[PDB]
Structures are given as structure tokens and as C-alpha cells.
């Protein structure tokens, strides 16, 4: 299942691949980022090759493509975090149990932003001892979503009389989504780690 | 999708009531009655949930590789209230649903013995006195003693903080309970409806 443009990992389960500026792969991410963070400068963009996380994500993706039929279930979103979390996220991905309370809470889950500018805030992408900030670029199974609310520990039901048939995620605003919250393991794949500085 | 499953007519979710006196029913019944012979079984249902099964088996193949042996699975019991059954059947075990103690961490708790899950704190009687307990395939893998406030199992060596145990327990020499902290580390295989 592992994508054919990945570096061969020598039967190994994980590695970070440093991208070259000039590559379309680095340049599209750099544009995605700079679209809203042109004040910051990119140190490097690493491709995250996590075999196990990839398989789990892809199983969850196929399931949601079957459940929802003809939907764009997948968005490419940003996640700022501190240096001390990068090793865990790289290995194990996004754990809602670890999530910070967001300044505007639309539920108890893992938050993803549309705009790099939002993830670029010191409150998420916290500067390390050397001034380095860290932002993931994340494939997120947003699926069918609704405006969330602070109490949510799972997405709400589409229909109150069928409690178990859930939305896939929640947003801050369904007509102009700037945030998405995700409540399940293996619903986000951390694809790139952007290291940047002022 | 396993051999003993029955036809679902191209559907991905079915609860299938077992036939008393047949082999599968007799196997699940005995594991319960080992410690719960004073109770009364009203029925045993096989949970056929293709998606949960797939996600579970994926985690199982990852844990067999990572642990370089095939010893990662145990059959354990989960007692729950009637209002949680529809959720568990369709979505499995969610650590975020959280009622009872979390002494060995903030995951989902499973018992070695049915008698443990058979307590009313866990398998809460409804109006009619009906109690509910899952027989659950759990990926216990390599385990350690748990403690309060864990959000994941501990690291196997603090030098490598991301190489984690698969589960925690109350007692490593003779465990009576296991806590798992990740979605798809438990597949609910049977639902036993019974009374005191
Ligand atoms: O069977 C159990 N169900 C539930 S629900 C919250 C905790 C527990 C639990 C804890 C230890 C052993 C079994 C169970």
C-alpha cells in the first residue's frame, strides 16, 4: 500500500525525508504556507513516511469513501504544535487525549486549521529554545461536517433519533470553515513537518 | 471477514443472535459461566461489523510485526449500560466516553473474568433487570503495571519515550484487568444479555 514516490525505508517502519526547494512537492507546500504566513521563513519541509499510520489512515479513508459515497472526504490542513510533541506525533499521530483546549472550543478533539497563519500563532506552534516553530501539513478525513460545540467528545449525530450515525467532523462555521475538529484515532495523517522561524 | 460469520446480503453491519446448544453459543456461554454460573443468559449475539473488524485486524498485523510474535490478542469482558450498546456495536470502544474509576489510566477497561464485568457499576441493570457484557478481542500485546492519569501506556524504555507498551494492567504477574488507550485495539465480538 505504501505510495511508490516514497523513499524505500529498508523494511523500516518510519523515516523523515527532507525535501528540496525547486521540487513541486516542496514548492506547493511552501506556497500553501506563505499564502497566509509570508512574514515567516521556512527552514525545511520533511515528508513523514509512517507505514503503520498510513495504513490505518487509508483504511479509515476507504471506509468513509464507501459510507458517504461521492464526497471529497479529505482536506489538507495545518496543525501547529510544540517541539516536545513532534516525536510522538511523528511516530503515533494526533491523540485527542493530549489536545489543548482551543481559545474557541467547538469540541474536545484534535484541531486542524485551513490557514497556516492560524497554526503559526505562538500558542500552537510554540517557539523552541532556538526560536524554531513546527507546523504539520495533515490529510484530514473531514467528511460530512457541522458547526461543533464545546461539550462534544464525539461528532454529533446527523439525526437525534439515530444517535450512532455521526457527522465525520465539526467546524467553526459550515459556510466558511476555518477550523476542523476530529474525535477518532487514524482520521488525520501527518504528511509534512514544516520547521520555520521569524 | 471471518469464516463463522453469516451472510449480510452485501451489508457491513449485522447483530446475529446465536442458536442455543450449537458449538459457537456453547463456547461463548462456557467462558461466561466459568465465573457467572449463578446468572441467566437471555441471549448471545455475534457482532458482525466489517469496518471495526478491518481496523482491528490492521492494528493486529501491525502489533504482530512490531512485537515479532503472535501472542498479542486476549479474550476479555466489557460490562456496560444499555444506552452504550448501540454505540459499541457500531463504533467499538472509545476512551473519551469515560462513570467509573480510571485508577490505571484514561483508557477502556476489560476484565479477565466475567464476574468482574457482571458488577452493576459496569453491566448496569435496565428497568427489566437486563445486564449487558461484551466478549471482546483485545490487543493486550506487551503490558506493564498502569497508574492513575496515564493518557497512553508508558514507554518500554525512558531512553526511547515513543516505543510504548501496548496495554497496562493492575498486576503483571496475575492480571485481572487491562486498559487500552487507542481506537481499534478492541473488537467487540459477542454481546451477552443476562440477569442476576
Ligand atoms: O467490564 C468493565 N466495564 C467498565 S466501564 C468502566 C470501567 C469498566 C471496567 C473496569 C475494570 C474491569 C472491567 C470493567
Half-sphere exposure of A159 (CA within 13 A, CB side): 4
SS3 A40: coil
Residue range(s) defining the domain that contains residue B184:
1-196
C-alpha cell of residue A1: 500500500
Instruction: Give the C-alpha separation, A122 to A130, whole Å.
Output: 14
Q: Among B116, B151, B143, which Cα is nearest to B131's?
A: B116
Determine if residue B68 is left, alpha or beta; phi over 0 gives left, psi from -120 to 50 gives alpha, anything else beta: left
SS3 call for A156: coil
CA–CA distance, B169 with A98 (Å, rounded to integer): 21
How would you class B124 by CB atoms within 10 Å of its CB: exposed for 0-12, middle for 13-18, buried for 19 or more? middle
Cα–Cα distance measured from residue B193 to residue B119, given in angstroms and rounded to the nearest whole number: 14
Q: Are B178 and B23 in contact (CB under 8 A)?
A: no
DSSP classification of residue A83: G
Residues of B with CB under 8 A from a CB of A: 12, 51, 54-55, 58-59, 62, 65-66, 86-87, 89-91, 94-98, 106, 151-152, 161-162, 164, 181-184
Test the A interface: residue of B47, B51, B141 with most A CBs within 10 Å: B51
Least CB-CB distance to A185: which of B54, B65, B183? B183
Taking each helix axis from N to C end, the angle separating A51-68 and B50-67, rounded to the nearest 10 degrees, works out to 170
CA pair distance B47, B35, nearest whole angstrom: 23
Phi, psi of B182 (to 5 degrees): -130, 145
CB atoms within 10 A of CB A174: 11
The secondary structure element, H or E, covering residue B170 is none
Q: How far apart are CA A51 and CA A57, in angstroms?
A: 10
For residues A49 and A17, the answer to whether their CB atoms sit within 8 Å is: yes
For residue A111, give the nearest of A37, A57, A179 by alpha carbon: A179
The CA-based dihedral angle spanning residues B149, B150, B156, B157, taken in that order and rounded to the nearest 10 degrees:
-50
| CA pair distance A17, A105, nearest whole angstrom | 34
Q: What sign results for the dihedral spanned by CA atoms B20, B21, B27, B32?
A: positive
- Residue whose entry in the numeric block shows the C-alpha cell 454460573: B37
Determine whether the interchain pair B181/A91 forms a contact, defined as Cβ–Cβ distance below 8 Å.
Answer: no
Q: Which of B110, B132, B148 to mutate to test the pocket of ligand 1 (most atoms within 8 A of CB)?
A: B110
CA distance A190 to A105: 22
Give the residues surrounding ligand 1 with Cβ less than 6 Å away: B 77-79, 100, 109, 111, 116-117, 122, 177
A138 φ, ψ (degrees, to nearest 5): -135, 125
Taking the C-alpha atoms of residue A127 and residue A109, their distance in angstroms, rounded to an integer, is 23
Q: How far, CA to CA in Å, does B48 sit from each of A117, B92, B155, B189?
A: 45, 12, 34, 8
Name the resolution in angstroms. 2.0
With CA atoms as reference, report the closest residue to B73 among B171, B148, B147, B180: B180
Q: Residue B173 is inside which H or E element, if any?
A: none
Q: How many domains does chain B have?
A: 1
- For B15, the 3-state DSSP assignment is strand
In this structure, what are the phi and psi dihedrals at residue B179, rounded to the nearest 5 degrees? -125, 130
CA triplet A78, A83, B155: central angle to 5 degrees?
110
The atom number, within ligand 1, closest to the CA of B110 reads 13
DSSP A98-130: GPPPPSS-S-SSEEEESSHHHHTSTTTS---TT
**What are the DSSP calls for B92-152, one per residue?**
---TTT-----TT-SSEEEESSHHHHTSTTTS---TT--EEEEEEEEE--SEEE--TT-SS
User: If DSSP codes are grouped into helix, strand and coil, which group holds residue B62?
Assistant: helix
| A106 exposure class (CB count in 10 Å sphere: 0-12, 13-18, 19+) | buried
Cβ neighbours around B172 below 10 Å, total: 11
Amino acid at each position: 500500500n505504501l505510495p511508490e514516490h516514497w523513499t524505500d525505508m529498508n523494511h523500516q517502519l518510519f523515516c523523515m525525508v527532507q525535501l528540496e526547494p525547486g521540487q513541486s512537492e516542496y514548492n506547493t507546500i511552501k506556497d500553501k504556507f506563505t499564502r497566509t504566513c509570508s512574514s515567516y521563513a521556512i527552514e525545511k519541509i520533511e515528508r513523514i513516511q509512517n507505514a503503520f499510520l498510513w495504513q490505518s489512515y487509508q483504511v479509515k479513508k476507504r471506509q468513509m469513501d464507501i459510507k458517504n459515497d461521492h464526497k471529497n472526504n479529505e482536506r489538507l490542513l495545518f496543525h501547529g504544535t510544540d517541539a516536545d510533541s513532534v516525536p510522538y506525533v511523528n511516530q503515533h499521530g494526533f491523540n485527542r487525549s493530549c489536545a489543548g483546549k482551543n481559545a474557541v472550543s467547538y469540541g474536545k478533539g484534535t484541531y486542524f486549521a485551513v490557514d497556516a497563519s492560524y497554526s503559526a500563532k505562538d500558542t500552537y506552534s510554540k517557539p523552541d529554545s532556538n526560536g524554531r516553530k513546527h507546523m504539520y501539513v495533515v490529510r484530514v478525513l473531514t467528511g460530512v461536517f457541522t458547526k461543533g460545540r464545546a461539550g462534544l467528545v464525539t461528532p454529533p449525530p446527523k439525526n437525534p433519533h439515530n444517535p450512532t450515525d455521526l457527522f465525520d467532523s465539526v467546524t467553526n462555521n459550515t459556510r466558511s470553515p476555518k477550523l476542523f475538529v476530529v474525535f477518532f484515532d487514524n482520521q488525520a495523517y501527518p504528511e509534512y513537518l514544516i520547521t520555520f522561524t521569524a
